[PDB]
Amino acid sequence: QTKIQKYAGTYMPYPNRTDGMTPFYINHLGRHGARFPTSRKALDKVEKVLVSAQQENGLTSEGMALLSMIRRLSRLFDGQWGKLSKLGETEQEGIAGRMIRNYPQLFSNSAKIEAIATYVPRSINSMDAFLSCMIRHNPALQVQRSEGKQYNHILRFFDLNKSYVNYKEKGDWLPIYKAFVHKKISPVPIMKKFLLNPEQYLDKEAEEFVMALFSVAAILPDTSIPLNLEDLFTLDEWHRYWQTQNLRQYMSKSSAPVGKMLPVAIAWPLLSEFIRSAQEVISGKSDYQANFRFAHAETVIPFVSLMGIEKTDVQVCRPDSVSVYWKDYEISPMAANVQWLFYRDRDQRIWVKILLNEEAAALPISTACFPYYSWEKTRIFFNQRIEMAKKTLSVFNE
Numbered sequence: 001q002t003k004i005q006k007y008a009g010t011y012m013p014y015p016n017r018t019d020g021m022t023p024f025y026i027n028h029l030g031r032h033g034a035r036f037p038t039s040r041k042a043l044d045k046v047e048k049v050l051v052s053a054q055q056e057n058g059l060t061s062e063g064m065a066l067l068s069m070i071r072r073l074s075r076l077f078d079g080q081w082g083k084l085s086k087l088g089e090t091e092q093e094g095i096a097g098r099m100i101r102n103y104p105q106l107f108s109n110s111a112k113i114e115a116i117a118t119y120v121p122r123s124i125n126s127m128d129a130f131l132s133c134m135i136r137h138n139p140a141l142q143v144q145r146s147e148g149k150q151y152n153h154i155l156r157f158f159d160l161n162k163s164y165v166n167y168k169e170k171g172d173w174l175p176i177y178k179a180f181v182h183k184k185i186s187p188v189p190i191m192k193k194f195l196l197n198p199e200q201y202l203d204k205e206a207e208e209f210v211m212a213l214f215s216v217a218a219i220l221p222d223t224s225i226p227l228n229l230e231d232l233f234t235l236d237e238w239h240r241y242w243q244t245q246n247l248r249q250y251m252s253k254s255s256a257p258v259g260k261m262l263p264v265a266i267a268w269p270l271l272s273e274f275i276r277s278a279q280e281v282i283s284g285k286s287d288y289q290a291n292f293r294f295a296h297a298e299t300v301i302p303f304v305s306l307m308g309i310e311k312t313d314v315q316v317c318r319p320d321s322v323s324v325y326w327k328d329y330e331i332s333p334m335a336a337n338v339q340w341l342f343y344r345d346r347d348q349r350i351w352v353k354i355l356l357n358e359e360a361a362a363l364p365i366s367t368a369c370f371p372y373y374s375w376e377k378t379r380i381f382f383n384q385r386i387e388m389a390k391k392t393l394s395v396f397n398e
């Protein structure tokens with residue numbers, strides 16, 4: 001299932017992880033856990049195509065079965081749109097649990113932690129699943145919990161930059177994505193499963209039907225509903241779908257040349273706030289043992305690219321090559337998270353280890369003891385990235 005689950009892309013459930021080496025601070029950004037679909041539009045598209053085909057003797061047996069299943073999913077999703085699922089809660093409990101067992105001294109005694117979230121409920125509920133796990137392990141923790149639009153500048157910067165919002169909604173990446181879909185998605189073999197004479201559908205309505213169907217199948221494992229549609233498609237069909245969605249995320253939210261790094265540059269306030277909270281703990285201005293932050297794929301993807309974690313800021317000029325070099329499911333699955341772990345050696349020098357989804361990440365700077373980087377060198381590097389981001393944003397004036 002490993003192959004196939006990756007092809008859900010940013011809908012992939014958080015992967016399976018297992019549990020003087022003690023950090024003095026953890027700096028965290030996490031996406032909410034596995035969630036319900038946010039929108040009924042894909043479901044409606046599939047249902048409309050199938051009902052119309054039923055009225056013209058257009059359905060196969062499996063098509064009729066699909067129609068009944070789509071109508072059932074409509075009922076099960078009602079009133080649940082965008083919510084954190086039971087799986088998403090367990091995902092946060094696992095991330096907190098492994099952090100506790102890996103670094104028990106950091107969160108022992110009366111350790112102080114702070115957590116923030118956006119105003120979106122699934123992110124608030126993810127923070128609370130995470131904090132409840134921490135408190136249950138150590139009720140003596142001191143905890144500050146807050147959330148809301150006051151954190152839009154660092155957690156929802158993708159909503160606040162007008163040039164980026166215009167790029168996201170109608171920028172030059174759209175024609176590239178649409179042409180890539182049209183060349184990658186062969187809908188006839190898929191549709192023949194459910195529809196008689198699929199060749200009499202226009203390419204455009206055929207692609208929309210198939211893409212909407214993939215979307216429904218792709219989000220279902222995140223809902224905790226005991227229903228599965230991954231078998232509607234072969235492994236090669238899932239591969240081709242994933243390639244189109246991977247390209248969509250890359251060009252709209254990351255370092256694609258067509259975006260001129262505007263999607264990445266907008267993340268600099270969060271990188272700046274990461275640096276400041278660490279520096280305040282190092283100086284004693286802050287006495288937190290950890291800062292946690294709960295937000296969205298749209299936060300994590302540009303933040304990771306701006307950090308320069310290797311591969312994630314690659315600027316690939318040929319769209320067909322993107323999937324070789326940049327993989328959304330390695331960056332922003334459900335419950336995606338970045339952790340900076342800070343250590344003091346016996347000479348009192350500060351080192352940092354970067355974890356992307358709980359695995360050590362590399363930076364394009366040197367170290368003689370990978371995966372630990374000099375914090376002084378890392379901070380200088382990150383400050384250069386922030387300055388580059390500000391210069392990029394100046395070309396778009398705002």
